[PDB]
Amino acid sequence: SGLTPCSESKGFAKRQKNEIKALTKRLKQYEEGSAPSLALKATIERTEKRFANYGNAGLLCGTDGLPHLISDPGLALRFGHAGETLIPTVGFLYIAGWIGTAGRDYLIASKGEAKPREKEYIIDVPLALKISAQGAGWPFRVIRELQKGTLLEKDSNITVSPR
Amino acid sequence: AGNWLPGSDTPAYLDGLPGSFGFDPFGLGSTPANLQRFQEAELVHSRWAMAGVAGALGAELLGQGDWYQAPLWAVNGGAPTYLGIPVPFNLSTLLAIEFVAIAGAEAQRNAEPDAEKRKYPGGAFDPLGFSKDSKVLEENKLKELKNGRLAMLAFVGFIAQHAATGKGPLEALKLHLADPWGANFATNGVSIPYL
Amino acid sequence: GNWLPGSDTPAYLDGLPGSFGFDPFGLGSTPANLQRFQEAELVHSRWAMAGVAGALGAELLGQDWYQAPLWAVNGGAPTYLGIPVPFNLSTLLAIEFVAIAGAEAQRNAEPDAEKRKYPGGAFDPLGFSKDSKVLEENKLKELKNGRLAMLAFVGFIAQHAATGKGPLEALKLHLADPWGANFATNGVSIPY
Amino acid sequence: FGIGHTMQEILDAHTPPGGGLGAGHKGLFDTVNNSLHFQLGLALASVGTITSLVAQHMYSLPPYAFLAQDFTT
Amino acid sequence: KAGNWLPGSKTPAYLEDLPGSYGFDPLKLGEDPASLKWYVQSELVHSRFAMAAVAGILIPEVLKAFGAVNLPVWYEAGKYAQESSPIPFNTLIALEIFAFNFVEIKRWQDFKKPGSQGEEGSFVGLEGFFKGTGENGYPGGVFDPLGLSKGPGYEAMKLREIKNGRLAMLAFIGFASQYLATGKGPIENLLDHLSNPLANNFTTNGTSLPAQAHPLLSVLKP
Amino acid sequence: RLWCVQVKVLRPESYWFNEVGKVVSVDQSGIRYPVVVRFPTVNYAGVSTNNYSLEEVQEV
Numbered sequence: 001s002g003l004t005p006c007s008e009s010k011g012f013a014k015r016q017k018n019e020i021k022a023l024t025k026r027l028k029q030y031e032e033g034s035a036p037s038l039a040l041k042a043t044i045e046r047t048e049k050r051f052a053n054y055g056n057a058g059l060l061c062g063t064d065g066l067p068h069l070i071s072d073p074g075l076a077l078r079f080g081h082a083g084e085t086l087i088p089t090v091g092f093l094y095i096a097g098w099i100g101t102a103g104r105d106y107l108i109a110s111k112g113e114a115k116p117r118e119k120e121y122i123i124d125v126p127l128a129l130k131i132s133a134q135g136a137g138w139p140f141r142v143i144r145e146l147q148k149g150t151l152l153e154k155d156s157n158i159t160v161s162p163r
Numbered sequence: 164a165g166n167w168l169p170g171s172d173t174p175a176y177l178d179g180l181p182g183s184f185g186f187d188p189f190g191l192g193s194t195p196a197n198l199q200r201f202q203e204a205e206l207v208h209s210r211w212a213m214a215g216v217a218g219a220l221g222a223e224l225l226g227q228g229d230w231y232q233a234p235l236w237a238v239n240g241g242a243p244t245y246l247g248i249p250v251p252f253n254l255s256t257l258l259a260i261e262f263v264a265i266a267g268a269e270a271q272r273n274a275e276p277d278a279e280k281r282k283y284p285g286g287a288f289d290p291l292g293f294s295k296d297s298k299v300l301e302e303n304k305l306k307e308l309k310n311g312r313l314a315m316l317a318f319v320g321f322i323a324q325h326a327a328t329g330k331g332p333l334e335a336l337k338l339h340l341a342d343p344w345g346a347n348f349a350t351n352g353v354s355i356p357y358l
Numbered sequence: 359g360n361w362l363p364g365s366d367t368p369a370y371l372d373g374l375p376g377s378f379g380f381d382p383f384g385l386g387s388t389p390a391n392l393q394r395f396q397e398a399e400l401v402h403s404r405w406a407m408a409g410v411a412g413a414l415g416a417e418l419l420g421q422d423w424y425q426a427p428l429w430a431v432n433g434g435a436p437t438y439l440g441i442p443v444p445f446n447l448s449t450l451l452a453i454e455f456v457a458i459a460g461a462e463a464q465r466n467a468e469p470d471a472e473k474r475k476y477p478g479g480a481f482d483p484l485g486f487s488k489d490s491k492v493l494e495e496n497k498l499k500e501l502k503n504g505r506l507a508m509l510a511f512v513g514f515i516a517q518h519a520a521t522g523k524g525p526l527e528a529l530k531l532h533l534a535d536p537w538g539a540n541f542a543t544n545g546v547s548i549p550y
Numbered sequence: 551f552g553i554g555h556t557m558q559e560i561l562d563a564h565t566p567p568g569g570g571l572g573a574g575h576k577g578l579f580d581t582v583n584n585s586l587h588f589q590l591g592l593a594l595a596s597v598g599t600i601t602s603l604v605a606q607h608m609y610s611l612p613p614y615a616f617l618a619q620d621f622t623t
Numbered sequence: 624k625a626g627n628w629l630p631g632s633k634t635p636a637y638l639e640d641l642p643g644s645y646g647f648d649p650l651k652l653g654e655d656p657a658s659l660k661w662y663v664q665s666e667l668v669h670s671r672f673a674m675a676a677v678a679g680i681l682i683p684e685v686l687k688a689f690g691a692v693n694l695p696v697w698y699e700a701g702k703y704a705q706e707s708s709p710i711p712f713n714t715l716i717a718l719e720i721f722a723f724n725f726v727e728i729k730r731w732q733d734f735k736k737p738g739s740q741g742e743e744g745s746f747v748g749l750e751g752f753f754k755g756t757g758e759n760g761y762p763g764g765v766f767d768p769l770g771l772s773k774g775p776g777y778e779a780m781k782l783r784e785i786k787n788g789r790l791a792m793l794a795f796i797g798f799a800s801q802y803l804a805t806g807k808g809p810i811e812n813l814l815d816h817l818s819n820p821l822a823n824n825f826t827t828n829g830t831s832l833p834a835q836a837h838p839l840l841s842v843l844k845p
Numbered sequence: 846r847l848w849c850v851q852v853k854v855l856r857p858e859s860y861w862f863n864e865v866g867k868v869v870s871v872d873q874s875g876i877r878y879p880v881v882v883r884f885p886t887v888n889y890a891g892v893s894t895n896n897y898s899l900e901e902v903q904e905v
């Protein structure tokens with residue numbers, strides 16, 4: 001996209017220099033070893049480490065000197081940008097399927113009790129913890145339920161409004 | 164006749180058809196009216212490819228250039244030549260009689276009411292009487308489709324080879340025979356794009 | 359006989375000509391497959407007679423079998439025995455196709471089953487055949503004599519793949535150096 | 551004049567034989583033709599989409615002389 | 624059942640009669656019977672692949688440590704083999720894709736319909752090679768040429784294959800992680816651990832315990 | 846039609862259309878909607894029972 005790597009971008013280096021300069025300008029009003037001086041020094045160290053880490057990660061910077069993420073799985077894989085969107089996509093989808101499968105399993109387990117509505121606002125905490133730990137293996141069980149036809153309710157068993 | 168994937172269930176509507184190996188994994192022939200249309204379409208594609216492959220290969224064996232090197236006299240300002248004999252036609256008259264001859268033949272083919280003669284017309288198209296015996300005709304129907312399916316893959320094999328390497332069909336066969344383990348579809352930068 | 363004494367032979371291999379009960383993988387379990395494999399074995403064995411008798415007989419007449427088709431690629435003319443021989447390599451494959459494919463097409467056109475394996479009639483000069491008592495005896499002789507012949511021809515190819523030399527001279531190296539020259543000494547058959 | 555298409559026949563013919571669209575577009579000629587609100591909805595959908603197209607194409611491909619320099623316009 | 628992975632726990636009932644079963648399924652992945660059959664086949668295939676791989680890594684490495692042979696190490700053996708390979712990289716990949724497509728489709732079709740690859744017409748005359756033993760993951764035929772599945776110790780060999788398979792899978796993942804963390808070979812890692820097991824382990828490779836996640840590593844040190 | 850038998854409601858304007866309820870009682874005096882059905886869910890009015898005709902309920 002016409003971008004340049006942040007490790008060689010002049011705007012990136014200028015932004016790091018300006019942020020460090022502003023923090024150092026704030027730093028000179030306090031005595032050495034005081035709590036504000038230590039806090040500002042820790043902020044300066046974090047700023048330097050962050051700019052170094054963003055430069056070392058292969059991030060691409062625009063004309064504004066700011067990192068730009070690449071989200072097409074093709075351009076990310078062939079140019080080393082998969083850690084920006086693609087691997088976070090896989091991680092989020094795994095965790096989201098975990099949460100959804102744990103909720104579905106808890107709802108289905110509570111459906112079989114004598115008071116199904118009771119477990120929805122007074123949580124069965126041991127059962128919820130057991131079901132929550134079992135959500136790690138959600139893709140296998142979910143894909144099997146999809147192949148078996150047990151994941152979906154039949155259309156004849158679901159209420160609809162008159163058309 | 165067999166199974167394209169041994170040990171697998173084949174669709175029931177494909178049983179008894181000529182050249183049938185139970186291959187319809189997408190279920191395109193599930194509709195009976197579509198399956199009848201696809202049977203004529205497969206045979207017409209087969210017969211055009213069988214003549215097309217023999218025309219493309221047979222002209223090279225007679226030293227008249229490859230199938231790709233045929234029509235550039237239209238764009239290079241040249242003249243047509245059949246076996247060295249000049250042909251006194253231009254593109255304004257070659258396509259005109261092509262539209263008249265082909266669409267005239269295709270209009271007669273489309274007008275047949277019954278399903279069998281839309282695939283196997285016979286009559287004037289079978290002067291040597293190969294359809295006199297039912298046993299020979301049924302076996303020849305399997306022979307036609309199996310040869311036709313090979314020619315359909317060969318002509319697409321002509322196009323895909325030339326779009327990837329730029330060489331001729333017999334040129335690529337010579338290249339493959341000269342070094343098989345280093346000259347194939349894998350060794351060009353087109354078929355597998357990420358090496 | 360038995361290929362492995364004490365082992366239980368398959369029941370479907372009993373009564374066959376040249377039968378030793380050797381089918382550990384059950385390839386001839388289906389009778390339709392078994393019938394075709396006998397014709398495949400006999401044709402492979404009979405062609406192995408011609409290959410060995412040829413390779414060995416020609417070099418007993420001073421004519422290597424590997425060096426025989428070495429006048430077309432490098433350059434030269436075909437030669438049989440000592441007579442200057444006509445035709446060319448391009449013409450040789452034309453007569454190769456018409457003679458063999460014309461003969462092989464008649465090999466399987468018959469509706470019989472024994473005739474595909476054991477033709478008889480016009481294919482048995484000098485009498486032979488007769489009723490049963492010597493026909494089955496040379497039926498056993500044909501498969502066993504054929505079996506070394508295809509083992510030897512594969513041995514002819516494999517030796518030249520490992521040593522690059524002929525089989526007759528490599529036999530002489532096996533008598534000159536019986537313990538220092540075999541398939542174990544060269545670094546091709548057994549690496550390291 | 552005896553030549554041309556009939557829209558009812560076009561609509562009735564366009565039903566996929568696999569049954570994916572059910573009866574297809576059968577009876578839709580009488581639905582569209584007898585309903586002024588169907589016709590008004592189709593006309594407004596197309597006209598509003600065309601109005602958006604006009605907006606998107608006059609700024610980027612200005613058709614009038616000295617229009618691109620008139621920023622307020 | 625071979626035992627209990629957690630003594631005192633309630634083992635699942637669907638893992639009672641499986642070979643190599645210790646009742647280990649806390650995630651309940653094999654609760655569905657079709658899933659259990661598919662995962663039995665998957666564990667066997669993974670086990671045999673890891674078995675052969677760990678053999679082809681460890682036996683050359685042990686022979687090199689004893690000084691018998693001098694072969695390239697496993698993480699670099701692809702480089703030295705490809706330079707002396709008559710067949711280049713792309714056609715090797717294409718040939719592997721073709722061959723594995725064929726053999727894995729045959730294995731998959733036998734899994735879906737047991738014994739189907741041994742019927743008449745399944746192969747071009749050679750279907751007797753693959754008649755099957757009627758068991759999930761135990762093909763036989765050419766794959767058992769010595770015929771020791773008909774022996775009395777067939778059930779013990781099934782247990783031996785599965786346990787050695789799990790050991791081999793853990794061993795290969797150990798080889799990969801040990802290279803990625805230490806940068807050296809597996810026998811080198813073993814000898815470093817045997818020289819000083821307190822100081823040479825995963826807690827000192829600088830990778831397995833990240834410094835940011837474990838601030839006490841830099842604090843509680845001499 | 847029986848007592849405490851699962852039935853599926855076929856009345857389209859009903860809140861429990863295509864849903865399964867339990868038969869409470871069936872009136873035998875020939876009224877228009879004799880089948881009394883109890884449902885595990887309430888409708889928008891908070892009611893859990895409704896009366897249906899013979900053709901409006903299918904035994905499941």
Ligand code: CHL
Nearest residue numbers: 697698699700701702703704705706712715716717719720
């Ligand atoms: C088990 C597969 C496998 C693994 C773990 C490795 C690992 C390695 N190889 Mg290696 N290779 C593997 C298979 C093969 N390699 C090679 C050819 C080479 C060469 C020429 C070189 C290496 C080198 C290396 C090392 C460098 C790191 C790397 O390249 O990561 C690769 C990591 C992978 C996981 C590769 C992907 C393997 C894949 C998962 C196999 C299965 C794919 C199938 C399509 C399965 C798909 C699903 C099915 C169900 C449809 C590393 C130790 C080199 C190195 O030392 O230099 C720095 C070196 O020069 N390999 C071929 C030839 C075709 C293989 C065949 O499968």
Ligand SMILES: CC1=C[C@H](O)CC(C)(C)[C@H]1/C=C/C(C)=C/C=C/C(C)=C/C=C/C=C(C)/C=C/C=C(C)/C=C/C1=C(C)C[C@H](O)CC1(C)C
Nearest residue numbers: 381382383384385402405406409412413423426508509512
């Ligand atoms: C039975 C079964 C049983 C179970 O179940 C399984 C198993 C075990 C697998 C199996 C066994 C087996 C066997 C081993 C196989 C192998 C074989 C043979 C070797 C073939 C051949 C094959 C062989 C034969 C044909 C032959 C060929 C021959 C030829 C003629 C040659 C020729 C030559 C000579 C003349 C000389 C010249 O100058 C040249 C040439 C021309 C070159």
